[PDB]
Write a structure and sequence with these properties.
homodimer; 84 residues; mainly beta; Ubiquitin Ligase Nedd4, Chain: W; three-stranded antiparallel β-sheet; 0% helix; Protein salvador homolog 1 (chains A, B); signaling protein; Hippo pathway; WW domain
């Protein structure tokens, strides 16, 4: 229920998808403006039942599962061996 | 603090990484056995500061950001237009 900055509101698409309106700039967004720490300019984190969590780049109209700032690939670590 | 099934315990690596021991099978795991709904056999979800959330495949010793059952690529949706 985190409070929006002045000049922001929340709305829903005709199919019921929540989104945010920035009346200061007349732009629309999928995520809360105060929930974007760690994300670069132009990107948002999206939650969904269809895809789970992913990331969108509005400038380039792209979506990807990898957080845009995460290492290019993650590391596999074998769980520790059983000791005797 | 979710209770473990019988024959399971929790331990830590020398560097302090939590893990789970299944004494029923003498196998080790990065995630709680009761926190794997929606994951296929052999896979685990991993949380980390280095990579954020990702997924590991123990059989093939692979790691990836995409949930193994998620669609191959996620969809970009443009936020709704401003109406006048």
């Amino acid at each position: 229920d985190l409070p929006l900055p002045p000049g922001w509101s929340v709305d829903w698409t005709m199919r019921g998808r929540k989104y945010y309106i920035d009346h200061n700039t007349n732009t629309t967004h999928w995520s809360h403006p105060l929930e974007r720490e760690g994300l670069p300019p132009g990107w948002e984190r999206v939650e969904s039942s269809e895809f789970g969590t992913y990331y969108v780049d509005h400038t380039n109209k792209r979506a990807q599962y990898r957080h845009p700032c995460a290492p290019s690939v993650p590391r596999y670590d074998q769980p520790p061996p059983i000791t005797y």
